[PDB]
Amino acid sequence: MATGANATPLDFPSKKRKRSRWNQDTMEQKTVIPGMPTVIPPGLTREQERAYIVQLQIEDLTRKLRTGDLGIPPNPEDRSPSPEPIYNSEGKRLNTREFRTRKKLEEERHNLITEMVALNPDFKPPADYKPPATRVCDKVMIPQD
Amino acid sequence: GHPTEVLCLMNMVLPEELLDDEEYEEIVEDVRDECSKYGLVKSIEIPRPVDGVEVPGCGKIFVEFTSVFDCQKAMQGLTGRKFANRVVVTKYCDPDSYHRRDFW
């Protein structure tokens, strides 16, 4: 050595084997395999890109409501307790938790549905997804001139 | 007609996560060590809205790769996985846009 030494701080590369950040199957045993590429092809639009991304998320979201594939909770450590923005008159005593999770899932999907339908008018939403408003009466009436 | 130079990482980062010092260091570090398994990664650009400074656009991050060779063998193995509970949509990005953070 000539004069002084600088050396390097002692730190070995961590975060290699502890928490998987590239899983695929949660809530159950790995057997249900999603088969669809995510990479986007060269020659599209920003709207269509989302539609392609969201369609995959829509099916995977629906997969989640279909089998109950949640995996990890949305909020592990809950924040300050806060009520709902939506006004609800009354709920069921037998049905509330189940529905809260499943409906929330439908809303995630719906969020994408509304987006994808806006991005692509020709988009066909999943069969289980129903258009809002139950409507009254039977069939349509006839306007006279 | 798709490989450019840098890798793209979408659908795996939320603005409510890229705001904490713990979550940030967790993503940048992990994503780095992982990206450095298929080849060489120059750096990583992940937005960090300051108290909501860069929220309008936050949600998409990526890493500056050295060669499209490893960039291809990397994204080909990152597609279909899951950052936590959502399928990661990986893609390709231009080094130019990366530099300007144009996000294209």
From Swiss-Prot, chain A:
PTM annotation (Phosphotyrosine): residues: Y87
Q: How is it modified after translation?
A: Phosphorylation on Ser-20 interferes with U2AF2 binding and spliceosome assembly.
Instruction: Assign the protein's first listed, main location to one coarse class.
Output: nucleus
Which terms are listed as keywords in the entry?
Acetylation, Metal-binding, Methylation, mRNA processing, mRNA splicing, Nucleus, Phosphoprotein, Repressor, RNA-binding, Spliceosome, Transcription, Transcription regulation, Zinc, Zinc-finger
The PTM Phosphoserine maps to: S14, S20, S80, S82, S89
The reported effect of S20T is: Decreases interaction with U2AF2
Q: One GO term of the cellular component aspect?
A: spliceosomal complex
Any one Gene Ontology MF annotation carried by this entry is:
mRNA binding
What are the subcellular locations of this protein?
Answer: Nucleus
> Where is the short sequence motif Nuclear localization signal located?
15-19
**Effect after changing W22A:** Abolishes interaction with U2AF2
Q: How does it assemble?
A: Binds U2AF2. Interacts with U1 snRNA. Binds EWSR1, FUS and TAF15. Interacts with RBM17.
What is the protein named?
Answer: Splicing factor 1
Instruction: Give the species this sequence originates from.
Output: Homo sapiens (Human)
Question: In the record, what lineage is assigned to the organism producing the protein?
Answer: Eukaryota, Metazoa, Chordata, Craniata, Vertebrata
Curated annotation (Swiss-Prot), chain B:
Cellular location(s): Nucleus
Please provide one cellular component term from the Gene Ontology annotations of this protein: nucleoplasm
- Name the source's superkingdom: Eukaryota
- What happens when you mutate F83A? Reduces interaction with SF1
Q: Which GO terms describe its molecular function?
A: C2H2 zinc finger domain binding; enzyme binding; molecular function inhibitor activity; poly-pyrimidine tract binding; pre-mRNA 3'-splice site binding; RNA binding
Q: Where is the RRM domain?
A: 14-95
Statement: the UniProt record of this protein carries the keyword Repressor: yes
Biological process annotations from GO: mRNA processing; mRNA splicing, via spliceosome; negative regulation of mRNA splicing, via spliceosome; negative regulation of protein ubiquitination; positive regulation of RNA splicing; spliceosomal complex assembly
Keyword terms, alphabetized: Acetylation, Disease variant, Hydroxylation, Intellectual disability, Isopeptide bond, mRNA processing, mRNA splicing, Nucleus, Phosphoprotein, Repeat, Repressor, RNA-binding, Spliceosome, Ubl conjugation
The entry assigns this protein to a family as follows: Belongs to the splicing factor SR family.
Describe, as the record does, how this protein assembles with itself and its partners: Interacts with U2AF1L4. Heterodimer with U2AF1. Binds unphosphorylated SF1. Interacts with SCAF11 and SNW1. Interacts with ZRSR2/U2AF1-RS2. Interacts with RBM17. Interacts with PRPF19; the interaction is direct. Interacts with POLR2A (via the C-terminal domain); recruits PRPF19 and the Prp19 complex to the pre-mRNA. Interacts with KHDC4 (Isoform 2). Interacts with ZRSR2. Interacts with the SF3B complex composed of SF3B1, SF3B2, SF3B3, SF3B4, SF3B5, SF3B6 and PHF5A.
Q: What disease is linked with this protein in Swiss-Prot or TrEMBL?
A: Developmental delay, dysmorphic facies, and brain anomalies: An autosomal dominant disorder characterized by global developmental delay with intellectual disability and speech delay, epilepsy, hypotonia, short stature, microcephaly, intermittent exotropia, and non-specific facial dysmorphism. Brain imaging shows a thin corpus callosum and/or delayed myelination.
Q: What does this protein do?
A: Plays a role in pre-mRNA splicing and 3'-end processing. By recruiting PRPF19 and the PRP19C/Prp19 complex/NTC/Nineteen complex to the RNA polymerase II C-terminal domain (CTD), and thereby pre-mRNA, may couple transcription to splicing. Induces cardiac troponin-T (TNNT2) pre-mRNA exon inclusion in muscle. Regulates the TNNT2 exon 5 inclusion through competition with MBNL1. Binds preferentially to a single-stranded structure within the polypyrimidine tract of TNNT2 intron 4 during spliceosome assembly.
Name the UniProt record assigns to this protein: Splicing factor U2AF 65 kDa subunit
Species name:
Homo sapiens
The upper taxonomy is: Eukaryota, Metazoa, Chordata, Craniata, Vertebrata
Positions spanned in the full protein:
372 to 475 of 475
